[PDB]
Amino acid sequence: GSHMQALSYREAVLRAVDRLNEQSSEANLYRLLELDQPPKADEDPGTPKPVSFTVKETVCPRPTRQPPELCDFKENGRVKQCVGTVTLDQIKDPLDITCNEVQGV
Secondary structure (H helix, E strand, C coil), rough: CCCCCCHHHHHHHHHHHHHHHHHHHCEEEEEEEECCCCCCCCCCCCCEEEEEEEEEEEEEEEECCCCCCCCCCCCCCCEEEEEEEECCCCCCCCCCEEEEECCCC
């Protein structure tokens, strides 16, 4: 309803990463491992906000009772770079973001 004082890009990535795990049909959860700093990430409220981050396979499968952050992380899991643009005030779906597998070994 009313969101008094609510405008942070880190919060948008936290909700985007959790929504991606529930919307995607993967077998294991993919919590955000590293977050990137896209162009204009905190200067467009009504407009869309570009978001980008890398996620890695966690020890907990999907969907887990709690969020993927609550569980551990599997360094042997694969990492993917989910990037897209989504507004921070009127978050809408589906989240138009693409994930590109990133090799980090």
